Structure formats: structure tokens, C-alpha cells
Amino acid sequence: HTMVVQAITFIFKSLGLKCVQFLPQVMPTFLNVIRVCDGAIREFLFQQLGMLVSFVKSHIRPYMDEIVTLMREFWVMNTSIQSTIILL
């Protein structure tokens, strides 16, 4: 879990705005991974999704609705995930 997403993030950062090409592949899978992940990985995935969104910028509009649903479902009073989501 940790190595796969650190790679995909590093790939997108090194490419620039040409990563937009890969969006339709990455996003639906990446979102379904956040859904079924458990425990610590959740927080890390949300952290790296934040990086993704900062690179994709305006192009993230089609998938934004799903991301909100994800956030809405996994927002808890747990202090740790709150700071993470507020950064995202």
C-alpha cells in the first residue's frame, strides 16, 4: 500500500500537467482503494490524494463529487483524520 501510492505521486509530480492524461485511469481505482482501505493507510491515502489534487488542479472537477462523498463518509471526531481532511 505505502510504496504503490508514493510512486504514483512521484510520477505525477515529475510529469507536471501532462499527468492529466492518466486521470481517468488513476482516479476511479484510487477512490475505490480509499473506500476499502482500513486503519492507518486511510490517513496516508488522504494525504497523498491531497498531493494529487494539488497537481491536477482544475482538471479534478469530474471526480470531485465522489471525493466529497468519501470525505463525508469517513469524517469522524477522531482528531487524527480531522487534521488530515482539513488539509485536504
Binding site: 500537467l17 501532462k18 492529466v20 482544475s58 482538471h59
Partner: protein, 48 residues
């Protein structure tokens, strides 16, 4: 009241001059069919 005229104030309402826009220059760098390199347009983008 005294039989005296009221001092007229400095009426500045009059327009100093009337301008006329005689001609117009429409410089259109549309570059139709080409996308500027600086901005990576989104696939829908804005077409109109």
C-alpha cells in the same frame, strides 16, 4: 428681507467637452485551432 439679489453660485454642471469615439481597433489573437503552450487547457475547456 432686504431688496437684494441672491449671489449666483458657480454652476459647474456644464460638460467641459464632448468626446467622440471615431474609430475602433479590434486586435483578435484568437489563434483558432491552436492552443497556447503556457496554459494547458482542459478537455472541455471554454469554447464559445
Amino acid at each position: 428681507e432686504k431688496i437684494e439679489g441672491s449671489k449666483s453660485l458657480a454652476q459647474s454642471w456644464r460638460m467641459k467637452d464632448r468626446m467622440k469615439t471615431v474609430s475602433v481597433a479590434l486586435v483578435l489573437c484568437l489563434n483558432v485551432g491552436v492552443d497556447p503552450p503556457d496554459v494547458v487547457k482542459t478537455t472541455p475547456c471554454a469554447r464559445l
